[PDB]
Design an enzyme around this catalytic site. Structure first.
Site, PDB file in Angstrom:
ATOM      1  N   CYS B  46       0.881  -1.157   0.000  1.00  0.00           N
ATOM      2  CA  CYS B  46       0.000   0.000   0.000  1.00  0.00           C
ATOM      3  C   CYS B  46       0.916   1.204   0.000  1.00  0.00           C
ATOM      4  CB  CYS B  46      -0.836  -0.026   1.265  1.00  0.00           C
ATOM      5  SG  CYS B  46      -1.562   1.536   1.740  1.00  0.00           S
ATOM      6  N   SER B  48       1.046   3.785   1.757  1.00  0.00           N
ATOM      7  CA  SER B  48       1.434   4.219   3.090  1.00  0.00           C
ATOM      8  C   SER B  48       2.777   3.668   3.547  1.00  0.00           C
ATOM      9  CB  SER B  48       0.368   3.817   4.075  1.00  0.00           C
ATOM     10  OG  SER B  48      -0.895   4.172   3.563  1.00  0.00           O
ATOM     11  N   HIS B  51       5.296   5.695   2.327  1.00  0.00           N
ATOM     12  CA  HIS B  51       5.374   7.019   2.933  1.00  0.00           C
ATOM     13  C   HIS B  51       6.378   6.916   4.037  1.00  0.00           C
ATOM     14  CE1 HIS B  51       2.540   8.846   0.473  1.00  0.00           C
ATOM     15  NE2 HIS B  51       1.437   8.676   1.183  1.00  0.00           N
ATOM     16  N   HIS B  67       1.093  -3.553   6.460  1.00  0.00           N
ATOM     17  CA  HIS B  67      -0.189  -3.502   7.169  1.00  0.00           C
ATOM     18  C   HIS B  67      -1.326  -4.193   6.431  1.00  0.00           C
ATOM     19  CE1 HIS B  67      -0.278   0.141   4.666  1.00  0.00           C
ATOM     20  NE2 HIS B  67      -1.596   0.011   4.614  1.00  0.00           N
ATOM     21  N   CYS B 174      -6.923  -3.293   3.732  1.00  0.00           N
ATOM     22  CA  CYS B 174      -6.591  -1.898   3.488  1.00  0.00           C
ATOM     23  C   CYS B 174      -7.122  -1.421   2.130  1.00  0.00           C
ATOM     24  CB  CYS B 174      -5.082  -1.683   3.609  1.00  0.00           C
ATOM     25  SG  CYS B 174      -4.492   0.056   3.736  1.00  0.00           S
TER      26      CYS B 174
HETATM   27  N1  LIG Z   1      -7.000   6.947   4.705  1.00  0.00           N
HETATM   28  C1  LIG Z   1      -6.756   5.640   4.799  1.00  0.00           C
HETATM   29  O1  LIG Z   1      -7.144   4.909   5.717  1.00  0.00           O
HETATM   30  C2  LIG Z   1      -5.926   5.142   3.627  1.00  0.00           C
HETATM   31  C3  LIG Z   1      -5.989   3.840   3.149  1.00  0.00           C
HETATM   32  C4  LIG Z   1      -5.200   3.498   2.021  1.00  0.00           C
HETATM   33  C5  LIG Z   1      -4.349   4.446   1.457  1.00  0.00           C
HETATM   34  C6  LIG Z   1      -4.283   5.727   1.986  1.00  0.00           C
HETATM   35  C7  LIG Z   1      -3.445   6.753   1.368  1.00  0.00           C
HETATM   36  O2  LIG Z   1      -4.107   6.934   0.121  1.00  0.00           O
HETATM   37  C8  LIG Z   1      -3.148   7.340  -0.867  1.00  0.00           C
HETATM   38  C9  LIG Z   1      -3.288   6.553  -2.141  1.00  0.00           C
HETATM   39  O3  LIG Z   1      -2.856   5.189  -1.944  1.00  0.00           O
HETATM   40  P1  LIG Z   1      -2.466   4.221  -3.175  1.00  0.00           P
HETATM   41  O4  LIG Z   1      -3.631   4.092  -4.096  1.00  0.00           O
HETATM   42  O5  LIG Z   1      -2.178   3.021  -2.397  1.00  0.00           O
HETATM   43  O6  LIG Z   1      -1.154   4.845  -3.842  1.00  0.00           O
HETATM   44  P2  LIG Z   1      -0.853   4.798  -5.414  1.00  0.00           P
HETATM   45  O7  LIG Z   1       0.404   5.430  -5.903  1.00  0.00           O
HETATM   46  O8  LIG Z   1      -1.222   3.460  -5.952  1.00  0.00           O
HETATM   47  O9  LIG Z   1      -2.028   5.793  -5.966  1.00  0.00           O
HETATM   48  C10 LIG Z   1      -1.739   7.216  -6.241  1.00  0.00           C
HETATM   49  C11 LIG Z   1      -2.219   7.786  -7.562  1.00  0.00           C
HETATM   50  O10 LIG Z   1      -1.978   9.207  -7.580  1.00  0.00           O
HETATM   51  C12 LIG Z   1      -1.590   9.528  -8.914  1.00  0.00           C
HETATM   52  N2  LIG Z   1      -1.008  10.886  -8.912  1.00  0.00           N
HETATM   53  C13 LIG Z   1       0.121  11.322  -8.320  1.00  0.00           C
HETATM   54  N3  LIG Z   1       0.258  12.658  -8.353  1.00  0.00           N
HETATM   55  C14 LIG Z   1      -0.875  13.025  -8.925  1.00  0.00           C
HETATM   56  C15 LIG Z   1      -1.215  14.340  -9.118  1.00  0.00           C
HETATM   57  N4  LIG Z   1      -0.333  15.327  -8.904  1.00  0.00           N
HETATM   58  N5  LIG Z   1      -2.416  14.536  -9.682  1.00  0.00           N
HETATM   59  C16 LIG Z   1      -3.182  13.516 -10.035  1.00  0.00           C
HETATM   60  N6  LIG Z   1      -2.841  12.253  -9.869  1.00  0.00           N
HETATM   61  C17 LIG Z   1      -1.672  11.973  -9.286  1.00  0.00           C
HETATM   62  C18 LIG Z   1      -0.666   8.369  -9.285  1.00  0.00           C
HETATM   63  O11 LIG Z   1      -0.469   8.095 -10.662  1.00  0.00           O
HETATM   64  C19 LIG Z   1      -1.413   7.177  -8.700  1.00  0.00           C
HETATM   65  O12 LIG Z   1      -2.231   6.550  -9.699  1.00  0.00           O
HETATM   66  C20 LIG Z   1      -1.796   7.150  -0.252  1.00  0.00           C
HETATM   67  O13 LIG Z   1      -1.283   8.472  -0.071  1.00  0.00           O
HETATM   68  C21 LIG Z   1      -2.026   6.345   1.026  1.00  0.00           C
HETATM   69  O14 LIG Z   1      -1.076   6.811   2.014  1.00  0.00           O
HETATM   70  N7  LIG Z   1      -5.092   6.081   3.043  1.00  0.00           N
HETATM   71 ZN   LIG Z   2      -2.844   0.890   3.255  1.00  0.00          ZN
END
Ligand SMILES: NC(=O)c1cccc([C@@H]2O[C@H](COP(=O)([O-])OP(=O)(O)OC[C@H]3O[C@@H](n4cnc5c(N)ncnc54)[C@H](O)[C@@H]3O)[C@@H](O)[C@H]2O)[nH+]1
Ligand SMILES: [Zn+2]
Ligand SMILES: NC(=O)c1cccc([C@@H]2O[C@H](COP(=O)([O-])OP(=O)(O)OC[C@H]3O[C@@H](n4cnc5c(N)ncnc54)[C@H](O)[C@@H]3O)[C@@H](O)[C@H]2O)[nH+]1
Ligand SMILES: [Zn+2]
Ligand SMILES: [Zn+2]
Ligand SMILES: [Zn+2]
Lengths: 374, 374
Positions: B46, B48, B51, B67, B174
């Site tokens: 994921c 995160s 990060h 996680h 997640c």
């Molecule tokens: N809130 C929660 O409980 C929870 C759960 C899961 C993930 C998250 C957070 O959610 C976020 C996304 O997770 P992910 O899908 O696993 O990561 P990921 O990289 O698979 O998805 C991110 C997307 O953002 C796109 N991207 C990047 N910059 C831009 C931009 N400037 N404008 C538009 N598009 C862009 C990129 O191509 C990608 O498709 C990540 O920051 C994670 O820390 N939070």
């Molecule tokens: Zn996650």
């Protein structure tokens, strides 16, 4: 008085900002197709009117401000079909055209035909309907009630019960309906909750009115003016807190007080800092904060997003979420049934001509709702 | 392997930030009272976890990350009453102690026993359970699944269907549950709506699955990585837009194409600017914008509050608002019932030892969910 053509009358013209109003004579044209000329019975002074003057709420000047009021119909323009002459009516700073997305949407109320997002200071025709000296005077929210006569679109008028005490019921045109609607409608306060209100003015006291109607178990009024505390407790508060008595931030004082945070908190003042403080002071995982105050023109607030991530929801609302034309008449009927009381909001009732004084009472903190009678 | 005491094993140790993971040996102590030791079958990468390494999500180092995973129960500490040894299960980064205000609140899910808001990097008892070289190592979100064996508290683990495909169902711990929960639980997308999704990665594509399950009539996926479009349309997107193709601001584009605004916007990236942009691109009077991405540690975003005064509602959430322990089991069952599909989200399935590679695939935008097998 009676007509079918131009009328000359007194009005509070505001020529420049940070200046007083000048009660002057104005030519109020007759209502065109679909508009109505109304004779102003009573007018409330809302902080938003004060914003115009201090320049925090930018709208085109010169202008006849005023928006919270009630009056009677003097005449009707071509086609109007909702209000007949002699009807007690209430202007609407938030219209209800009935055709746009928002009016069609069962939830939204901020009609696309409002003049708040981007002030033109005109009528729907994109034209004025006032002249002072030789020059044309702008409108305000398509209402402008600081005048004995005014003409609003059919879109922005609501027929009110004939037996309405227009001297009480004018509050329902802004102050009350907003605060009461923020609590019962937008935020949706629940029986047993614990709310916090920032700003114990007319609308603030009205939110406390809503929360108490919603069944909140606790109601924490917060204000830097100790004097507002009694009116607060009178209408519904359970306690009142003044930021300046404490050595630690109010959100901290509030979180500790609430055993971790508020259920629903409200910002009914208008400043950026208290907007955040109201958000932060509500429960990180399910607290809702409703922004009610109107901030200072083009100012940006800074806040850390984690406050939201945790699960907090931040809402904002105009006119308390209420769909103007449908709501006001319904609301008035409730006032009639005695389902609520506007009295506690009323602390002064000066006559129109003493407008500048009622505004002085506001900014000094010794009044709440001050009703200008005409 | 089986025990009742220390177990030596492999794990991805993160010693410092902006450095590769180090696959090495750790002594995984047996589960204390109300703790559970678990054998890791599969784990998802994921954003995160990444990060953490970049320093965007500050958690104490050195640490064994991970996680989203599923595993089988090796051993249980004294008093455990929920899972037996041999049960297929899923650790949970979002606890569910069941005693706190949040768990008691029918709506909120962010448990007060979480280690996300204030990362300790330990277990509930404030102690570790990992020792590498000679020095102890911190845990992550009280799960840390990037290890062959790990120990979670009884509150952070969900027993799942004995017949569940653990190398698919791990996504439910997640990525899936959050994306799917944001749209169906948090923002409450409605039949006929027009949703917009910022970020087309694992979590975003799952939100698109949500909106579509909810019946959104239009889902506009936004992403700067053109490559993400096919998969997006594939899971449910109606169209895809890329910021870089236009000469005019994205919100302006979304608003123009949505006839004044989207009903529900989502931010699944974690960038500040796109958190605002996603807010503004939704309907001024009834739009809802849910922030899902996780922002850069101590950063504050600037935004004009008038955006919310109009009627917009800004939400934020962790784990899609799902109450962990009660949700995961039920969601797994839904998987079995063929109520949804995790397949499209999985694009790589490397072996644990290839962790640093699965991470490169993320950073290089050529993957979505890379399931690490143990
Ligand atoms: N809130 C929660 O409980 C929870 C759960 C899961 C993930 C998250 C957070 O959610 C976020 C996304 O997770 P992910 O899908 O696993 O990561 P990921 O990289 O698979 O998805 C991110 C997307 O953002 C796109 N991207 C990047 N910059 C831009 C931009 N400037 N404008 C538009 N598009 C862009 C990129 O191509 C990608 O498709 C990540 O920051 C994670 O820390 N939070
Ligand atoms: Zn996650
Ligand atoms: N969005 C809408 O529909 C809507 C409706 C009506 C009014 C408004 C806006 O809401 C705001 C207030 O309305 P009102 O009741 O007429 O105004 P008011 O001036 O009667 O009340 C302001 C109250 O805020 C208190 N206050 C001011 N500063 C602080 C502070 N720094 N800390 C704590 N308390 C403080 C102050 O003492 C006073 O009691 C004002 O900004 C107005 O423009 N918006
Ligand atoms: Zn007002
Ligand atoms: Zn309308
Ligand atoms: Zn809990």
């Amino acid at each position: 008085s009676t007509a079918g053509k131009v009328i000359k009358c007194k009005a509070a013209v505001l020529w420049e900002e940070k200046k007083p109003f000048s009660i002057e004579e104005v030519e109020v044209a007759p209502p065109k197709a679909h508009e109505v000329r109304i004779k102003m019975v009573a007018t409330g002074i809302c902080r938003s009117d004060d914003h115009v003057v201090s320049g925090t709420l930018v709208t085109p000047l010169p202008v006849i401000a005023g928006h919270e009021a009630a009056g009677i119909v003097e005449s009707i323009g071509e086609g109007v079909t909702t209000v007949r002459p002699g009807d007690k009516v209430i202007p609407l700073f938030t219209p209800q055209c009935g055709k746009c997305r928002v009016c069609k949407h069962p939830e939204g109320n901020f009609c696309l035909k409002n003049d708040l997002s981007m002030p033109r200071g005109t009528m729907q025709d994109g034209t004025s309907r006032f002249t002072c000296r030789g020059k044309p005077i702008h409108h305000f929210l398509g209402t402008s009630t600081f005048s004995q006569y005014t003409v609003v679109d059919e879109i922005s008028v609501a027929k009110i019960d004939a037996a309405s005490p227009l001297e009480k019921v004018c509050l329902i045109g802004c102050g009350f309906s907003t605060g009461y609607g923020s609590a019962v409608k937008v935020a949706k306060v629940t029986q047993g909750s614990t709310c916090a209100v920032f700003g114990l003015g007319g609308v603030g006291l009205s939110v406390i009115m809503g929360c108490k109607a919603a069944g909140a178990a606790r109601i924490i009024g917060v204000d830097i003016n100790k004097d507002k505390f009694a009116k607060a407790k009178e209408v519904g508060a359970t306690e009142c807190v003044n930021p300046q008595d404490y050595k630690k931030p109010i959100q901290e004082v509030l979180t500790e007080m609430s055993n971790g945070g508020v259920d629903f908190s409200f910002e009914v003042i208008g400043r950026l800092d208290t907007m955040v403080t109201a958000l932060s002071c509500c429960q990180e995982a399910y607290g809702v904060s409703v922004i009610v105050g109107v901030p200072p023109d083009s100012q940006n607030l800074s806040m850390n997003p984690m406050l939201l991530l945790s699960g907090r929801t931040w809402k904002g609302a105009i006119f308390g979420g209420f769909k103007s034309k449908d709501s006001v008449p319904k609301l008035v009927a409730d006032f009639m049934a005695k389902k609520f009381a506007l009295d506690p909001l009323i602390t002064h009732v000066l006559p129109f001509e003493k407008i500048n004084e009622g505004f002085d009472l506001l900014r000094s903190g010794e009044s709440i709702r001050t009703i200008l009678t005409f």
